[PDB]
């Protein structure tokens with residue numbers, strides 16, 4: 122499903138465990154995804170659902186909750 | 194004219210998707226690569242950030258020279274020698290970290 | 293060797309040259325030829341070596 | 342004591358420097374190439390959007 126594909130992608134793009142990645146798990150703090158890590162995470166998320174996100178709309182996303190929200 | 198240009202646009206779209214997929218796979222692999230060196234290898238020994246400003250060719254060449262020397266260096270310890278010899282495979286990089 | 297890309301060839305050449313540097317410490321002549329040939333743009337040099 | 346320490350120091354110096362050179366090189370090339378690919382992808386993305 123989408124809500125688990127998101128966790129899969131986030132985990133294997135940051136190495137974080139499935140448990141650490143809750144809907145509120147903020148990437149920069151909770152998952153330690155830095156600038157390039159955040160960019161790569163959004164890149165892999167776009168790949169996963171073969172969809173593209175606007176630049177400001179993409180950067181706005183900074184939390185697993187917001188990521189799923191935009192994705193779904 | 195605009196339609197002609199949109200042709201190039203679509204070509205570039207395909208190219209960008211390819212590059213995106215490649216970088217995605219690269220990051221996925223580098224995650225495990227890092228989590229190997231994550232065990233106290235990164236700080237001052239395995240990561241050497243002053244080297245950030247050179248290209249694959251020079252790095253590979255000097256790595257090969259270093260290995261040509263080190264293999265003779267590791268002539269003694271059979272298992273350490275085996276780690277070196279196996280990690281000699283460039284296609285499976287993190288071996289060299291484990292070594 | 294036509295069936296391998298340039299990167300592999302370069303890697304193999306450098307890997308050989310490393311052991312050559314280790315070994316050549318014996319003889320001055322081979323060492324001189326090496327110290328002249330190791331540069332890329334002088335293939336003939338390596339050949340003489 | 343001097344002999345023991347000199348021998349071991351020399352051996353460890355040699356092995357550490359060689360191994361670090363060898364392995365850090367491949368690591369750093371992987372890192373630089375990944376960064377360069379990211380940079381190229383960003384350039385492509387921006388140009389495509391424009």
Ligand SMILES: *P(=O)(O)OCC(C)(C)[C@@H](O)C(=O)NCCC(=O)NCCS
Nearest residue numbers: 155156157158160176383384386387388
């Ligand atoms: P990290 O601190 O390395 O930062 C990376 C980055 C956020 C600067 C990078 O991912 C990025 O966004 N670069 C492109 C910025 C942009 O919108 N450019 C316009 C189109 S070329």
